[PDB]
């Protein structure tokens, strides 16, 4: 019932490593489902002081439940890309939505961003719902933007703005 964000810590990397090798999950991020731990580790150390990203762990009643990240934070144009995952066992309990709100909250109320966008698979109508109902609207359809498990996929670019998130939950 209670749902929070906290930073991805070094001691959380074992959890990330499992997700990042789950093809069913990684295909949603359009991420190649292959990661040796040492690669993960060496890249997390490399980005410690990278100010263009914030990676979070999602906790549902003190349990690790998924991942939210904000990436490509650009501060002159005031925008970033948003991306999220819920562990397979924590799925279908409302979490994506609750955790997406926390993210946007952080983008708009902490990072002082103007825009948030995301990319989703055209076929992922479940997720597109979540985002339409959150107030994201479609700004692009990228044809064949990704080759995933055997074929080209189309990607939907959705976004939402600061003044609109802020108006809607004030």
């Amino acid at each position: 019932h209670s749902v929070k964000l906290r930073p991805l810590e070094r001691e959380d990397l074992r959890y990330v490593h499992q997700l990042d090798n789950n093809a069913s999950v990684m295909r949603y991020w359009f991420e190649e489902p292959y990661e040796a731990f040492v690669e993960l580790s060496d890249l997390y150390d490399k980005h410690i002081h990278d100010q263009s990203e914030r990676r979070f762990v999602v906790e549902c009643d003190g349990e690790k439940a998924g991942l939210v990240e904000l990436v490509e934070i650009n501060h002159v144009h005031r925008r970033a890309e948003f991306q999220i995952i819920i562990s397979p066992e924590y799925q279908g309990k409302g979490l994506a939505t609750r955790a997406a709100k926390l993210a946007m909250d952080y983008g708009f109320t902490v990072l002082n961003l103007y825009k948030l966008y995301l990319i989703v698979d055209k076929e992922n109508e479940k997720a597109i719902h979540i985002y339409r109902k959150l107030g994201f609207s479609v700004e692009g359809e990228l044809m064949h933007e990704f080759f995933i498990n055997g074929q080209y996929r189309n990607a939907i670019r959705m976004c939402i703005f600061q003044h609109q998130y802020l108006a809607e939950h004030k």
Copy 2:
């Protein structure tokens, strides 16, 4: 009348430097018109072995006339982004068209890419016309994607595919 592409060389940097500090030119690339030469020289050296990009100078009858760049070269998804600049005194001679073709030829016939794409200002009605001619179609309207010169702008994402290009200029 004679127009080629060659790699951007150390000795070309000075010419790039003047362009990179031209607000009216740099607005086309959504690119902050500030650059100290030592920053350009450094980032050029940093990227020497960077396989994800190819930087070219456009030559017209042996004279330097602008710049083409394929960037974000992703070889799993077989795509790249392309950008182009014709220096102010060479504008009005058809060179951009000629350079796009040279660029498309490059990524399609040399790099074995499947998809090329570009980002233009929604208000750039000239260039947007030049690419529809060339086969590109619109795949997104990036809204307020860039803060340029005092206000946010919209960017048109336009793409073309290898099959299109190969089939056509056979």
Copy 3:
């Protein structure tokens, strides 16, 4: 009720870690409430020989009750910024006031500072109460200095001088 300052130690960083991710508390320091433990470590290591700061742990009967720091120590102009935090579980016991005067003592009678200054949220009445009983005057109001949790905030700049401190404490 024994109260004293000691330097911030490596073995205290986990304690600092919790407070740095505590949004309620970070908001008043005007600090983004996000910190991975590895970021906090690297920075504390980076700063070990920085002579422009002094970070203390506040101890109450030996158990560790908050943080107080003098940063931006400039000895030519002989001034520093003061920041204090009392951990929630230790609030409302007269600790801030006490820690604050230990800090003021330290800056005035060890560092030989002429001027001590601080920045507070205009809405932070309990802190301002505490600073005025300590003797600080308001020198400035900084308009929209910080975007905190959804909106621009106003910052009060308060200060106090060596002769106003030394001529009160014998």
Copy 4:
């Protein structure tokens, strides 16, 4: 009659080194008037990739006339601090006002900042006139912020906002 900003280049550094040793001028930036060339040089190199500043040369008809800088560019809070020097022999010809707006134009239309601010000596009424004329409003008086040439000195913090500047210039 013609006035421009360009970036501070490596080869402008001997011109900076002269001003930075000129005590009547440096007193207006609250800056100790002592700088070996090799110190300037090393600090310029250290900052080449520092995205928190932008240093410009002021040109008047193709001549080095002065310096304007935005520094402490903080992009979450969307502010920076502004400073300007006009060379003695180029003083009294109107250039401070020009380069100032040129620079404000930059912070507001290019860097997308929300607030620009500045510190002036309480007795430098010329400058204070120029900045008032230009839209800046007083927000603080830092008492005895700087010990300069033999005595403590009071600095006035003045600001301006994007909406104010953009309002007044489109």
Copy 5:
């Protein structure tokens, strides 16, 4: 009988170590059968961010039964070399065939490869059997390519293409 690929991990290297000193097995990879554990470690560390290879562990009911790898991944020409090994104690159970098709799957449907090729000993009939049932054609015979255990050996170069794989597996 559950069978799957995961990346080669540091904690697997001891397992790799045994196989690399096993002459009977190394002979077919055309690999000198000598490896100190420190050589294997340094090289595995050296290669962590090499994107030209993917090394997998083959798992049978979770217990680790062999190795399969795609090396020389070239994405311009969109090809890679395939090598497989099934540990002795796990041979003759239909594991190679299965692992091999998981690898082919991976190269064809994740890496977006056009061509997969391998090199086998002409005398290695059980491997050639296995490759022909998988669909590979012989493209070359390499005369005296390797000196293995006392004499020059002949290598068969077999290959298979994306459209021959994708148009078999639905």
Copy 6:
């Protein structure tokens, strides 16, 4: 009328940089025709002590006429791969044949290799003639090994052996 091999020196590199950007020539080495001078330069330096290759310049009467290289020199298996370019303006005068035997002489009489091999485009019948004439025999046809100028291309692997070459030349 006079023909020699000498080593590729640092000061021959601008001559190499021209050929390496000449697309009609580079297509015959299956090599992307794009090379900034600083990339060539850095890669030459990286390989100075690389004992796995030997690069030569072809001289004709004291003039740079072309390039011949042995690479992938593998000494346990006693083989290397051979490649040659003759400059366009020096073509059709018999030099390929000379430098080729000069180079083979080197692999066989100096480096003590057992096998020399080479890749040719299935349609480059000139070269194939030269290599047949010279003793090389076909051993493979790599189908669609290279995507070059717009299409996949077939490469013919040809070899020769020490005993064959030494037989035929003492």
Copy 7:
């Protein structure tokens, strides 16, 4: 009853850290009473091979009792500064005197120094006694040489020479 000197070891640093944070004790050395362990540690490693100092631990019957150091050992002018501390619990038992003798002994009989000097607070008549009775005589009174707990203090410079220590205890 038995009293010796031994070198300050790494494993003694925890003891030094406590003294170095005791304001009552550090004020006698005119040393700012603030030291994070890591600073102490990083400075002790930095000075391991520094031939201009010798730091000792003072043992009273095998117990850690205080610190003696000889610093600024200059060997052309043949002198060094001497400084000492006795833990508060080991005070008033004769130790300062016994340990000062051991120090001088080391200066004069081991290091072959000509002069030893020390600095003490004008008010520290207890210590001045110890040193007058040891044969040190006053060579300076440095007015306001130190700012300590809230005000300027005068420092007494005392010294003694090799021939005189040696004559006196021979």
Copy 8:
């Protein structure tokens, strides 16, 4: 007749080098008259960002005439030491007096120091007179503090305070 102080520059080192190898000059600073240029060049580069010192060249009518140095700049205790040299051919023109004043002005009005001090030879009856004129009083007689030219010497420590100086040259 015209006399200023400026920072010691790389290009000044040669002049310093000649002075630093003059026994009759260097005896004034208690300074071994040996220095290879490469040692001076190195120690100069080592100290570039050394905040505890400021080195000046004394100029008389644009010509280099000697050297001033504030060293041991301690900002907690607000003091520094000063030293001065007038090159042999400029002696007898009052320049040292003029340089001390320039130096005192520097540390008192720019550096905000509380106490300046210097060390002279007891036999230097000239200079010792020049500083009593200037306000300095004697605060120690350093006995046999330096071995110079065959015998130990006594040094007079002389000091002046900010209040004295400021009050006097107002």
Copy 9:
């Protein structure tokens, strides 16, 4: 009864360290009988990627029994030096011979060497036997090639060739 070779591992170095300090044993390798562990260790790490040597441990029924190394592996001239030791307690049981055969085997059947040579003490008629009976013949007598336990010793150079080892055991 069963006898094998395996690579010298890091965890075998303690065993090597004992042999390498046994003067009776080291005198046979003409090696100075003195080795600190850290030297051994630092040299084994230094040579990990040295392709000119292979060091083996000799196991007799799973027990560490001696050392065989092949060194100075030269691949153009196709030869290497061979050297061997049997622990004193494992001596006189046939091991040298069995282990020498394994070595030669590796030289000739794995490393594809043409020649193997060795050096032995003229007096070591026991060992010379082993090698004559293995088919090694004498190619040199190096007079006074080594100073060993108190005097010059003559060394016998023996060798054997690939075709001859191979013929003899086929």
Copy 10:
């Protein structure tokens, strides 16, 4: 009573540490009796590959009884310095004599030295006794070579040659 030399090992350094702070013993090596364990470690590490020295532990029935060393090993002039120490608790048992001859053996029959020499305190009669029974002649008396514990000392330089050693020991 078994007596032998082994090299000085890292795990012996604590044993060396005690002796290096033992003034009674250090005086005869003319060694300052001060050593922090970290200094001893760094230096032992620094010297690992120094081939100009050999440091031994002296073992008596396996338990470690002293130190013997050959330093300043010069092989052109074929000489070295000899130093020995027997730990107090192990003195007066004929150990020095024995260790000394093991060392002499080592230098003469392993290192192939022509000359061995040592330096002793003129007052060190028991050492001189021991060296004369070993066969060393006095070659020099060094006047006031060392200042040890309060006074200049006189050093005897003794030596012995390969032919005086080898023609005594058979």
Copy 11:
């Protein structure tokens, strides 16, 4: 008529480079006639402090005429190897004889070596004669020790001892 040896200098490298790429010369040293200048320059810098070798240029009447080298200088066993080259245009004037003598003089009278040795081609009947004259005797016939120019060669190892040389040219 006048002939000396001097050290090989950086400025000599070019001359060495030409020799090192002369097959007919380099065959004498069993040395692959390939060398890029940058490799020679690098290996020269690598060996600057390499005590095991001395490289000389042979000068005849001030003109460079060839090269001598003492390598594998082993000072325990007191031996080295020597090699010599007379450049083609200086051959036939007795210079090699003269250079060997200069070389022998060097290792015997300067380096205190006991044994010098060299390796010649069995077919080099000239030089083999020159060294028998000089005192050298044959101590091995290295069979097929080098693969040169298409076939294996035999090398004659020849040596001379210090006593011989000293006794003779006294």
Copy 12:
């Protein structure tokens, strides 16, 4: 007629390189006569900050005439070793004696040493005369200390003391 010491500068090094290759001269310093310029150069750089030596050039009327050095400057024992060379063409004019006293003056009056010593060849009676004349007394005869030009040689150690030199020269 005029004679000076100055420091050995970087630009005196070619003059040193000539003497260091002159065998008649170097034999008098017991120094192998072989030195590549780059070795001298690197060793000079390595020693720039080495406080244990001081190297001087001898000038005669503004000309390089020779070299004098103090080395092994040991300041606890207050000694150094002294060496001198006078150039051949500047020999026999009295300069050795001058530069010698100049140098002794330095060790005794500047560096405050207690003892200066020197090694001479037992047959260099010139020098021995000069040093006797000058105050030096014999203290040892090192038998067969150096193998120089073909034979062992005896060195005479001579010293002098500060009190002796200062006595004799004030």
